[PDB]
Design an enzyme around this catalytic site. Structure first.
Site, PDB file in Angstrom:
ATOM      1  N   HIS A  41       0.804  -1.226   0.000  1.00 45.18           N
ATOM      2  CA  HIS A  41       0.000   0.000   0.000  1.00 45.18           C
ATOM      3  C   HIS A  41       0.844   1.286   0.000  1.00 45.18           C
ATOM      4  CE1 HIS A  41       0.134   1.113   4.305  1.00 45.18           C
ATOM      5  NE2 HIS A  41      -0.006  -0.184   4.599  1.00 45.18           N
ATOM      6  N   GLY A 143       2.276   6.091  10.331  1.00 49.81           N
ATOM      7  CA  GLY A 143       3.693   6.012   9.990  1.00 49.81           C
ATOM      8  C   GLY A 143       4.363   4.721  10.443  1.00 49.81           C
ATOM      9  N   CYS A 145       3.397   1.610   9.669  1.00 50.85           N
ATOM     10  CA  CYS A 145       3.247   0.554   8.658  1.00 50.85           C
ATOM     11  C   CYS A 145       4.584   0.036   8.188  1.00 50.85           C
ATOM     12  CB  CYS A 145       2.405   1.036   7.483  1.00 50.85           C
ATOM     13  SG  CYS A 145       0.659   1.256   7.879  1.00 50.85           S
TER      14      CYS A 145
HETATM   15  C1  LIG Z   1      -6.962   3.899  11.490  1.00 57.91           C
HETATM   16  N1  LIG Z   1      -6.888   3.951  10.042  1.00 57.91           N
HETATM   17  C2  LIG Z   1      -7.129   5.064   9.357  1.00 57.91           C
HETATM   18  O1  LIG Z   1      -7.483   6.108   9.902  1.00 57.91           O
HETATM   19  C3  LIG Z   1      -6.941   5.014   7.849  1.00 57.91           C
HETATM   20  N2  LIG Z   1      -6.190   3.880   7.345  1.00 57.91           N
HETATM   21  C4  LIG Z   1      -4.817   4.186   6.935  1.00 57.91           C
HETATM   22  C5  LIG Z   1      -3.950   2.927   6.973  1.00 57.91           C
HETATM   23  C6  LIG Z   1      -3.758   2.507   8.434  1.00 57.91           C
HETATM   24  O2  LIG Z   1      -4.566   1.783   9.018  1.00 57.91           O
HETATM   25  N3  LIG Z   1      -2.667   3.035   9.041  1.00 57.91           N
HETATM   26  C7  LIG Z   1      -2.274   2.872  10.392  1.00 57.91           C
HETATM   27  C8  LIG Z   1      -1.535   1.784  10.860  1.00 57.91           C
HETATM   28  N4  LIG Z   1      -1.265   1.529  12.148  1.00 57.91           N
HETATM   29  C9  LIG Z   1      -1.727   2.383  13.052  1.00 57.91           C
HETATM   30  C10 LIG Z   1      -2.478   3.542  12.740  1.00 57.91           C
HETATM   31  C11 LIG Z   1      -2.938   4.455  13.724  1.00 57.91           C
HETATM   32  C12 LIG Z   1      -3.615   5.585  13.360  1.00 57.91           C
HETATM   33  C13 LIG Z   1      -3.871   5.857  12.021  1.00 57.91           C
HETATM   34  C14 LIG Z   1      -3.461   4.993  11.044  1.00 57.91           C
HETATM   35  C15 LIG Z   1      -2.753   3.805  11.368  1.00 57.91           C
HETATM   36  C16 LIG Z   1      -4.658   1.806   6.241  1.00 57.91           C
HETATM   37  C17 LIG Z   1      -3.922   0.806   5.606  1.00 57.91           C
HETATM   38  C18 LIG Z   1      -4.572  -0.301   5.093  1.00 57.91           C
HETATM   39 CL1  LIG Z   1      -3.628  -1.587   4.391  1.00 57.91          CL
HETATM   40  C19 LIG Z   1      -5.943  -0.438   5.172  1.00 57.91           C
HETATM   41  C20 LIG Z   1      -6.685   0.565   5.770  1.00 57.91           C
HETATM   42  C21 LIG Z   1      -6.055   1.701   6.284  1.00 57.91           C
HETATM   43  C22 LIG Z   1      -6.864   2.743   6.944  1.00 57.91           C
HETATM   44  O3  LIG Z   1      -8.036   2.561   7.216  1.00 57.91           O
END
Ligand SMILES: CNC(=O)CN1C[C@@H](C(=O)Nc2cncc3ccccc23)c2cc(Cl)ccc2C1=O
Ligand SMILES: CNC(=O)CN1C[C@@H](C(=O)Nc2cncc3ccccc23)c2cc(Cl)ccc2C1=O
Ligand SMILES: [Cl-]
Ligand SMILES: [Cl-]
Lengths: 305, 299
Positions: A41, A143, A145
Site C-alpha cells: 500500500h 507512519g 506501517c
Molecule cells: C486507522 N486507520 C485510518 O485512519 C486510515 N487507514 C490508513 C492505513 C492505516 O490503518 N494506518 C495505520 C496503521 N497503524 C496504526 C495507525 C494508527 C492511526 C492511524 C493509522 C494507522 C490503512 C492501511 C490499510 Cl492496508 C488499510 C486501511 C487503512 C486505513 O483505514
C-alpha cells in the site's frame, strides 16, 4: 524470580529497518540481503485505498519512483516485484548487518516481539500475541506501517509479522513476510471489523504453571475435570477450546510442578467462577493469556519454589 | 491506538555486553571504550580491598562473543569493578552514566553469560527496588534510557531480595536503596504507589478513548494528599502537577480534576471495569513515557 512480559533484544532487527517513500507515502521497510520488503500500500494515494488495483498502480511505477533510505544513505532500487500484499524492492547494496533469518507464518496464540518504527527509525520494542481473531493488540500510530514482529530463538531471527493497518476498534492487522494476511483482512479501507475475540486458554494455563513455579498455589483445588467438561465451562467465558495438542504441549510444565494438566484446568474453572477476591497472580488481577508454554519455560527457572 | 509497556530498542546496549569470569563466579560486564564495568562481587562479610589485592589481571577472563579480551588493569569504584582491557569497544555508543530517582522508568537488557536474552521496561520503586525478572547469572545486567542517539546507563543489577524483587547500583557503583553487596539479612522496605505515574496512565487512557472514570469534580492538593496517604500512594507535589501540564492541556482535564477521578477509583474500585486492559491502577509509565508513546518519538 519475577515474571515480566519480555521482548527479545531488538538489535538484529534494528540493523534492517529502512524508510521507503513512494510519492507522498512514507512507511518502513525491512532490508535483508539486497531486498527491501514493505507493505504494497506504499504505492496507494489514500483515495486509491477504497478499491485499489495494485497491479494497475504498480505497472505505472519505475525503480526510481521508490526512494529507500538506510540511515543517511540512499539505496538505489534496481528491481521490484509484488508477492501477495508485500512489495519487494531489489536494491544495489546487500545489507552488511543482515542477520541469520527465516520467514515463519505463526498461528493464533503464538507470541512475538514488535519493533515499532517511524520513518525507518525504531522507537520502541514490546511483546505481543497473535489473537484468536488474527488481530494483534499493538501500540501503533500513523507512519508505523511496515514495522515487524519477530522471535529470536538462538542467533536466528524468525520474522513472522509486518504491520499493515489499524482496524476501527484500535487493534492491528498485518501479513506474514510473504504478504499473506493473518485473518480475513484486506489491504483496502473497506468496512472490516475484527471477529469476536477469545482468551487463549493454553496460554492462561502456562501462566498458571509459571505462578506455581514462582512459589504461588493459592488458586489450586482438590478437583480434576474431563477435557470435555472443561471446554463446556470455558466456552461460557469466551475461552478458546483446549485441544489434546494443548494438553500435550503442557506436559513439561505439568511434570516440573507435579500438577496434572486437567487438575490445573479445574483451578482455571474455579478462577473463572470465583474471580481472584482481592488477590493477584504474578502481579496481575486478570488471567494473563499472552505467554505461551514455550515463553514460560524460557523465562522461568527450571527449579520450582 | 494501543498502549503497551514499551522498552527502548536495545541494539546499542547489546554491542556492549560481555561475560566476566573470576574464579568460580561468572556474571555480565558492560564494555565501553577500553573499560569493562561489572559488580565487584565477581571477586567473591567480604573485605573487597583484601580480596582485590590478591588478584592479578590474568585472573579475570573477559569474553566478548567468541573473542577473549586481555585485562591490563583494574580498579574499584564503590560497588563496581572497572577492568581496563587492551581493546576499545568498536561498538561503543554515545553514552552518559546517570543516577535516576524513584518513579523514573528504564529498559533492562537481561543477560546470562554475556549474552542478552530479553528486554523489558520497569520503574525504580519508591522503596528503591525494581520488580524485575532475573535468574542466577543475571548479575551485571543493565538498565538504560535513550535520548536521541545517547544511551544513559542508570542501573546495574547486583542481587535478588527474599521477596523476589531486585537491587542494584548506578554505573558509579552507588546502590539504589539501603542495600549492601553481601548475602545478609536484607529486606525491601514497604512499597508505595507512584501517584504521578498513575495520573499519567489515566491521561493515556483518556487519549485512547477510555473515559468512564471521569467526573465533574475537582479537589485541593491537600485533600488529595490526605486520601493518597490512606491508600499507600506517594504524596503528589506541585512539581508533579507542573509535569502533568502538557497532558492536562491535551485532554482538557485539569490535574486536580484527574486527582478527583483517582480518589473515586481508590474509594470505590473499578466495579468490573478495566482501564487500558488493566483491572489495577498502573504506576510504571511516567508522564514522559505517555507523551513519547502517544506521539511517535524515534531514536
Ligand atoms: C486507522 N486507520 C485510518 O485512519 C486510515 N487507514 C490508513 C492505513 C492505516 O490503518 N494506518 C495505520 C496503521 N497503524 C496504526 C495507525 C494508527 C492511526 C492511524 C493509522 C494507522 C490503512 C492501511 C490499510 Cl492496508 C488499510 C486501511 C487503512 C486505513 O483505514
Ligand atoms: C536470592 N539470592 C540468594 O539467595 C543468594 N544471593 C546471591 C546473589 C543474588 O542475589 N543473585 C541473584 C540476582 N538476581 C536473581 C537471582 C535469582 C536467584 C538467585 C540469585 C539471583 C547475591 C548478590 C549480592 Cl551482591 C548480595 C547477595 C546475594 C545473595 O544473597
Ligand atoms: Cl506458531
Ligand atoms: Cl509447588
Amino acid at each position: 524470580s519475577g515474571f515480566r512480559k519480555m521482548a527479545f533484544p531488538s538489535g538484529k532487527v534494528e540493523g534492517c529497518m529502512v524508510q521507503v517513500t513512494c510519492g507522498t507515502t512514507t512507511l518502513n521497510g525491512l532490508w535483508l540481503d539486497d531486498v527491501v520488503y514493505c507493505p504494497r500500500h506504499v504505492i496507494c494515494t489514500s483515495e486509491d485505498m477504497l478499491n485499489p488495483n495494485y497491479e494497475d498502480l504498480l505497472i505505472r511505477k519505475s525503480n526510481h519512483n521508490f526512494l529507500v533510505q538506510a540511515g543517511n544513505v540512499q539505496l538505489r532500487v534496481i528491481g521490484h516485484s509484488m508477492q501477495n500484499c508485500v512489495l519487494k524492492l531489489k536494491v544495489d547494496t546487500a545489507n552488511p548487518k543482515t542477520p541469520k533469518y527465516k520467514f515463519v507464518r505463526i498461528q493464533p496464540g503464538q507470541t512475538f516481539s514488535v519493533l515499532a518504527c517511524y520513518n525507518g527509525s525504531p522507537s520502541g520494542v514490546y511483546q505481543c500475541a497473535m489473537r484468536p481473531n488474527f488481530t494483534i493488540k499493538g501500540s501503533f500510530l500513523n507512519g508505523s506501517c511496515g514495522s515487524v514482529g519477530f522471535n529470536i530463538d538462538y542467533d536466528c531471527v524468525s520474522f513472522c509479522y509486518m504491520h499493515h493497518m489499524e482496524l476501527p476498534t484500535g487493534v492491528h492487522a498485518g501479513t506474514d513476510l510473504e504478504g499473506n494476511f493473518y485473518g480475513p483482512f484486506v489491504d483496502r479501507q473497506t468496512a472490516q471489523a475484527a471477529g469476536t475475540d477469545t482468551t487463549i486458554t493454553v496460554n492462561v494455563l502456562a501462566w498458571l504453571y509459571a505462578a506455581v513455579i514462582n512459589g504461588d498455589r493459592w488458586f489450586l483445588n482438590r478437583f480434576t475435570t474431563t477435557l470435555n467438561d472443561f471446554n463446556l465451562v470455558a466456552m461460557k467465558y469466551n475461552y478458546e477450546p483446549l485441544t489434546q495438542d494443548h494438553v500435550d504441549i503442557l506436559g513439561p510444565l505439568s511434570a516440573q510442578t507435579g500438577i496434572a494438566v486437567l487438575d490445573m484446568c479445574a483451578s482455571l474453572k474455579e478462577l473463572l467462577q470465583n474471580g481472584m477476591n482481592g488477590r493477584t497472580i504474578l502481579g496481575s488481577a486478570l488471567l494473563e493469556d499472552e505467554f505461551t508454554p514455550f515463553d514460560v519455560v524460557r523465562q522461568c527457572s527450571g527449579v520450582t519454589f
